[PDB]
Design a binder for this molecule. Structure first.
Ligand SMILES: O=C1N=c2cc([N+](=O)[O-])c([N+](=O)[O-])cc2=NC1=O
Ligand SMILES: O=C1N=c2cc([N+](=O)[O-])c([N+](=O)[O-])cc2=NC1=O
Lengths: 257, 257
């Protein structure tokens, strides 16, 4: 039985309301739960969904050299595959294998409806409306390293803004936008942004085009005997229109706004 | 010296007008020429750019079983690597390996400026403005296989439309949009659509969102000693902003509109 590590991130993997009455894989629902069943069908395996212990995606502590999260579970042999919204990055790709992306995304801007901001350029031209990113990760790194005039200006502002515009978690960034009365905008991944936009109380909005591009992929330990088939399954599912069907299902069909 | 196969497709690879006075890789210019140099540098190999003999991407004859194009050049050992706008697809990944995508794209609609069409649903609700795809390939198959009502409606129309709405080449689909006085819309790659949008006479426009998601990838034979490095180089180039810099350079900085 293949041990699948995943993460409780909506709408990818969520506990069903009546989860206490259920056991195993049936306790969960979501985009990745559906995707897991599809991957298993196309690769011919049985699996057990397990939520990553530390609730993380996966980063390497710079001093201790240790990997946490789902990446850590793969690197250390605790799971056979990770079917979750895990970003395909260079550092991760160096220690684990990734399938081709099953979903594309990029940095975007989330505002509280009513806020007079329509782009990154709008944000950069003022300070009245504070804006920031998660305190660590791809979005923060993008701005810190950017050579582009507009993004570099946003970085100079964010890195010295007081009080701090950085947040510890994505939920905090979304909550800060919602409870800041039009005075805060949050830079986060487009997928999460468009998802929140379809959730009650329907008070947020995604503005402007994506600032960069990246993709989520299914991961397996380096040299895994599942890698090849998993990759082919992703490509097949995309061409069959299934990946798009699942995106529409969990974001819009199940939307509230 | 690595033998790289590529294709003369703008703005990816263009033969400099004064190529006779030039030698080797210096005879060409374009997005893929710049990409080849970056990949070569980040993988530590010397290479020679060659233009695919039959000028094709790579398709397997339903009867002959023979692979044409760049894919054929790889599976038959005529080239070690393909650095071109080669779409990552299931049929091709069955016989060659693809790196993570260096460019994202999807089926899009090209119209003559002024055409009262903003989406696929708009096209599907009328017949006055004819629309079609290349007479063979990915975009045609997308419509033929779709279970989505709008796309199925569009297929039923294109299949029996008279005069024929299918074109022999991409250049013909583009020329047909330009010369049909707003009475023809062309379905093609978003990358090519946005490229043509930046070329004189500046009479075309990309409208609506992409109907699907695909990516271009660097291709190498199965078991290639170049596979791992190439993959890492693509991710690094994306994270350092180089791929976005490259596209902006060839599509917009050099744009004529
Ligand atoms: O791998 C990752 N995947 C992510 C996926 C999401 N997600 O939205 O699914 C988010 N996020 O919530 O912004 C952050 C992420 N950070 C990561 O490091
Ligand atoms: O792999 C391929 N790559 C393509 C790239 C392009 N391109 O973007 O130049 C086109 N197109 O433009 O139609 C068609 C393609 N067809 C293919 O089958």
């Amino acid at each position: 039985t293949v041990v699948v590590t995943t993460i409780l991130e909506s709408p990818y993997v969520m506990m069903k309301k009546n989860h206490e009455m259920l056991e195993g894989n049936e306790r969960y629902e979501g985009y990745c739960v559906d995707l897991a069943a599809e991957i298993a069908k196309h690769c011919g395996f049985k699996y057990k969904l397990t939520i990553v212990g530390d609730g993380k995606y996966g980063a390497r502590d710079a001093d201790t050299k240790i990997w946490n999260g789902m990446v850590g579970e793969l690197v250390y042999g605790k799971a056979d595959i990770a079917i979750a919204p895990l970003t395909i990055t260079l550092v991760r790709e160096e220690v684990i294998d990734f399938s081709k992306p099953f979903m594309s995304l990029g940095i975007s801007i989330m505002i509280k409806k009513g806020t007079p901001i329509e782009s990154a350029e709008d944000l950069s031209k003022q300070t009245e409306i504070a804006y920031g990113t998660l305190d660590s990760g791809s979005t923060k790194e993008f701005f810190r390293r950017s050579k582009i005039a507009v993004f570099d200006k946003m970085w100079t502002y964010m890195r010295s803004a007081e009080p701090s515009v950085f947040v510890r978690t994505t939920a905090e960034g979304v909550a800060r936008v919602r409870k800041s009365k039009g005075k805060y905008a949050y830079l986060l991944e487009s997928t999460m942004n468009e998802y929140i936009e379809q959730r009650k109380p329907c008070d947020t909005m995604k503005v402007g085009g994506n600032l960069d591009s990246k993709g989520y992929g299914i991961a397996t330990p380096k040299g895994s005997s599942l890698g090849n088939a998993v990759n082919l399954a992703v490509l097949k599912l995309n061409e069959q229109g299934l990946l798009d069907k699942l995106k529409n299902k969990w974001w819009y069909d199940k939307g509230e706004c």
